[model samples]
Target: LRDVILVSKDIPEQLCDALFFYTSHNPKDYADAFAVRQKFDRNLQTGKQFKFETVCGLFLLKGVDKITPGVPAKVLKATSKLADLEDIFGVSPFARKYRELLKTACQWSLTVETLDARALTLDEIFDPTEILWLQVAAKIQVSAMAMRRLVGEVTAKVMDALGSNMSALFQIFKQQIVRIFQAALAIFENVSELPQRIAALKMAFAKCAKSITVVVMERTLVVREFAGTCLASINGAVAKFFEELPNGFMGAKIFTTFAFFREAAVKIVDNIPNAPRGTKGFEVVGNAKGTQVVVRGMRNDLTLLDQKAEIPVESEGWSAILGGHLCYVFKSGDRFYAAPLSGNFALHDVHCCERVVCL
Candidate 1:
């Protein structure tokens, strides 16, 4: 935020405070306020067309409509719109909206072209649009910077887990915990809207589950950037603050879930089945009851029910379901590393498994 404003010489001073608040404090609203026109007069008709095209390009991921038929020339269509929007931004009352559309088109265009079945160089396939580049550059930078901090935190946490000194334990734990807080802040900087939040959760979850590869992980991050863009452009600080609070609250829930599972395992193992009870059939697969049931038994069998399901389910740790997702975010890590948390899969898992060993 402060750093962005320091470099935003082209942006007006009045818009800077608003932009800073939007970009730093609440990015979604900043985008919307800047982009949306107060008056929807006849001139904005063209802006509306591009917005629709942009939306389709983003949501459908179909380049055919964006370019030349189902052919390679189709690439030109999307790229052309990118240029068209850039032109629109210059004179239109809806400058912000126009630029956003251009950015989306640029990203989506690049995405399909990059992922195309056929190989092609960027310079040959697509021309750079300043507006799109500006938007994408800002977003990519945010994610990259945040990721660097996360990697550092992971390294620290892993190192701590391998050390034996009590001082080392405290040193590592403090930094590791701080990284979680930092992640909460980064998430606040990105992501807005309930749907987009859920989408991000799904992306992060899928990545953790190994359903998607690392390359896919980067593309899925488009979800966070898109949603966060909306939040900065539309809703103000209230939106930004509330959105951020979830990560911390969610973190506590995750911490508790792991505790319950570990405790229950110590007491009893082999009793709980991974799948839901009735869905898989009535019988329990394995059983060795301990102090408490780590996995909850189904409803209608309170007497039959072995463990407490409320904690994991509500806490977002329902193992067979989203349990893997929650664990991926908060736990799993190196032995003594303390990288800053990104809440993204690869690092999140490393941070969780990492532990401190003390004399």
Candidate 2:
């Protein structure tokens, strides 16, 4: 923050401190702040409508009617009002409403104007409006230099699973994960809600699960790019098959439902016959027993009642559930070459011979 004032030149130091606090707490908004900072900087230069248009166009992935007035125009209006209301820094009563508009506008627009240091009225050499704007500018500059780090983290997680010497299908899965994200975003047209967004993400993952050609017994990653995006509400878990019958019939079925660091209610029930919208009855599938649930980070080679899984790091030994719509089971404990992820499948006839913990 000290160096923030260094580049700021005429921008007041206190405002930098305030912005530092604001942007520090709101990490996700950093990207939008980055855009705001760019636009602000450009406005400082050869200011034009195109710069504003560019920022809006990039994020205009959602439907219209989202931001009714052109956001840039709102930006201009607020600045025009801010200049009218404040002196030395937001002084004299212009209107109580303009204060709120200025704050809202600062949510995206960072700098009021390329500034100059001066002693003032209410407070010496400090304008609250100028501070919010310039403070945001510093935070956004920080975000701009750091944005790729999260994607790199996700990419490295995959690289850890597949060695620097990547397997063909293994590497292919990586491309598919990123493309699945792209396809999910593409198919989605609304931005007004959550379920709709998850559905879109779930749709791409579900569709891609059908295209696998590799039958090799390898552990592979079916989940990717969590935290990097909110579409991560959908997740994956390791499902281990217990036993294969002599007649090739089904045996004890088990898949890791609850993993670690996740909050969830775990349960197992028998599918019973019923008469609803073609529904059925149920019973207990596994005996309630005390077991050593394996927890891992660095993917346990590793549970309990249903548990939630979070942040599957590289080699967290995961089998994805196609966003919890359907799950697949794998034959357990072979000389597993750890590129072990596979396509998604159903939970029927999952075999559990050994007392394996939940994923």
Candidate 3:
């Protein structure tokens, strides 16, 4: 029987704590886990060779310890995107709006309605709790926005690499993310509704976004797992290449951690509902007829084909995400059509367009 070699022995304190925090429902855990693993060095099961550790670390953790005993430069480069995400409330428009609203509300005097209204000073409107809430809101917003953007960017990278259906899925995923940001931005349009808006935003950051937090935590784990699997593939290829050498050196096994952490990890944000939830009736695709018309459909259902065959592609309505552009789905009678909704679309010759929704 072949010997069963051990790779990682006891779990590090940081690793265990991160796992606990992640499983127990905390966004900080995910970040902590990545941080803990970031600087640590991975060693071989047999010897104390720093060279082996350095090489293994480079392959597994995407880091090396040559000039320094820290993480690999490539690892840092990969993680830079995630690290760039600011806290939920940090420097966001909502944070500014929150403070502005509170100041305006504080300045409002009940005596203003009376004949002899006196101007209120700073002392009368002093409330620290409101300030703290605003501070806390900023922190929460920073984390939430970071998680959402991280997920979107990673998923986009992975799907783009996979191509075909996966790429299509990513396109939709990106569209949804943009819509969420848009919604969050739109909340600032009405200053009069700031109080109610801030209240709801606070609740969402605490509760609804918490659900997204859990999703991100799980996603981090998934990315780690997938990266480990990919490492095995890399190790196998390396072993095969070395075996062809004339020296006939024994093949070395390399242990790898998640390398695609930045690319494949995606937090599950439910802010934007997935398009064509049920029975997509038909999806839109690009057209080859050289006309301005584009193709669209769902599963095996093709909208262009249906139109040509005089077959009505009935749907409850559909939505799509265009690249830096806006697309619309129109429902006419029992049929649905997809068109650009960004600038202006002349609906001159086209008939049966009942309702339109932009995405």
Full-model lDDT for every candidate: 0.24, 0.27, 0.28
Write candidate 1's Cα lDDT for 1-359 as tens digits.
Answer: 11100121233322221222212111132233223221111212222222211311211111122222432221212123334323322232233533443344434334323222111222243232212122222233222222222223333433443233223223424434344434432432454642344334223322222111111121011112213332222123323322343232112111111111211111112123443443211111111111111223222201111112111112111112122122221211221211111112112112222222358
Q: Whose TM-score is greatest here?
A: 2
TM-score of 2: 0.23
TM-score of each: 0.19, 0.23, 0.19
Sort the candidates on lDDT, descending order: 3, 2, 1
How many steric clashes does model 1 contain? 60
TM-score of 1: 0.19
Ranking by TM-score: 2, 1, 3
Q: Which ten residues in a row have the lowest lDDT in candidate 3?
A: 248-257
Query: For residue 106, what is the lDDT in candidate 2?
Result: 32
Candidate 3 backbone clash number:
19
lDDT of 3: 0.28
Q: How far off is model 3, as Cα RMSD?
A: 26.0
The residue-level lDDT of candidate 3 at 193 comes to 60
